[PDB]
């Protein structure tokens, strides 16, 4: 991964919706839970070993391919991308007969 952008943001101020664990009290109930604006958690990830910039480049180089996928499907909203990537990950190793001492077989 060679970052070929004009400039790069070395700092990643990321937000996500995955809970960090240790949910306090009964705040998981939607009635007592936060509004749509306060369900996010934040974090700061610095540029380590040239990762951050590279990540951005990756996104760029992904875009084209992703667009083509969105052209092929007729889903108004596509959520099953990560699941499909996992399925292909499993098929890559265990899709066919797994011959011991083979290149396409991951055993011991």
């Amino acid at each position: 991964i060679v970052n070929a952008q004009p400039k790069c943001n070395p700092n990643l101020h990321y937000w996500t919706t995955q809970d960090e664990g240790a949910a306090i009290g009964l705040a998981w109930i939607p009635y007592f839970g936060p509004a749509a604006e306060g369900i996010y958690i934040e974090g700061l990830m610095h540029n380590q070993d040239g990762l951050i910039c590279g990540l951005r480049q990756l996104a760029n180089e992904t875009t084209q391919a992703l667009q083509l996928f969105l052209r092929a499907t007729t889903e108004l909203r596509t959520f099953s991308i990560l699941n499909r990537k996992a399925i292909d990950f499993l098929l890559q190793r265990w899709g066919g007969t797994c011959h011991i001492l083979g290149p396409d077989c991951c055993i011991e």
Partner: antibody, heavy 131, light 110 residues
Framework: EVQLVESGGGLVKPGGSLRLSCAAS????????MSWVRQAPGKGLEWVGR??????????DYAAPVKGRFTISRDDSKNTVYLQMTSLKTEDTAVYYC??????????????????????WGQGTLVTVSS | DIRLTQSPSSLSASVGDRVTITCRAS??????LNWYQQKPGKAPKLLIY???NLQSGVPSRFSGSGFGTDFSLTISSLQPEDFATYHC???????????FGQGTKVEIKR
């Protein structure tokens, strides 16, 4: 690998002129921004001036207590930057440091703000003004 | 235009302690701070650019943090060569008169 050397400092009487020279080696001088930052004995660091590269137009900016009395210039064929001091006042007695804003840190600024991060610092020179 | 205020002004700690210096800004600034190390008699040496980013060659014990108005510099375990005065400088706008902080001088305890 990168080294900067300041020269020209000395004693000058209040109201006189003085010329400071900054020699640089180890990088691409024509693409880097240069800056002068002075340190008073009891006032900490104080930014003096900034000059862009010939690519961005080479516009010059000065500090508020400094405008109208100093003038910055640069020579790319010799990789040198000069600071001229006219109508100098006793409050300008300081240790002057010459700094560079390399092209690599231009690449890390992503919001395209004019401010710069000072990459490398030279030995510095002493400028004393007293009667 | 922009004011930077460091805290504390002086600090005394032992070898191997966790040291934290705070830099506060007057206006809004999104990770334009820079941490410089200046040893007495020598020139300031750039340690941290933007936020939490270490310059090549800086040891791993140095770390930055924070955004917006407040920023934090942290040394995990002090060492004898870390004795120096550290400064925080903003790069959000064209530098004003108070763009460089007054400075925080770290002192080693024995």
């Amino acid at each position: 690998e990168v080294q900067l050397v300041e020269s020209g400092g000395g004693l000058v009487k209040p109201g006189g002129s003085l010329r400071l020279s900054c020699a640089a080696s180890g990088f691409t001088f024509s693409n880097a921004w240069m800056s002068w930052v002075r340190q008073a004995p009891g006032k900490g660091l104080e930014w003096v001036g900034r000059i862009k590269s010939k690519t961005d137009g080479g516009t010059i900016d000065y500090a508020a207590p400094v405008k109208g009395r100093f003038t910055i210039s640069r020579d790319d064929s010799k990789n040198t930057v000069y600071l001229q001091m006219t109508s100098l006042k006793t409050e300008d007695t300081a240790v002057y440091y010459c700094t560079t804003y390399t092209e690599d840190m231009r690449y890390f600024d992503w919001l395209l703000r004019g401010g710069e991060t000072f990459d490398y610092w030279g030995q510095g020179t002493l400028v004393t003004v007293s009667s | 235009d922009i004011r930077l205020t460091q805290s504390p002004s002086s600090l005394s700690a032992s070898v191997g302690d966790r040291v934290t210096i705070t830099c506060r800004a007057s206006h809004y600034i999104s990770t334009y701070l820079n941490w410089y190390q200046q040893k007495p008699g020598k020139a300031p040496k750039l340690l941290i650019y933007a936020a939490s980013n270490l310059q090549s060659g800086v040891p791993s014990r140095f770390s930055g943090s924070g955004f917006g108005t407040d920023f934090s510099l942290t040394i995990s375990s002090l060492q004898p060569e870390d004795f120096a005065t550290y400064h925080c400088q903003q790069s959000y706008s064209t530098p004003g008169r108070y763009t460089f902080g007054q400075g925080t001088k770290v002192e080693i305890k024995r």
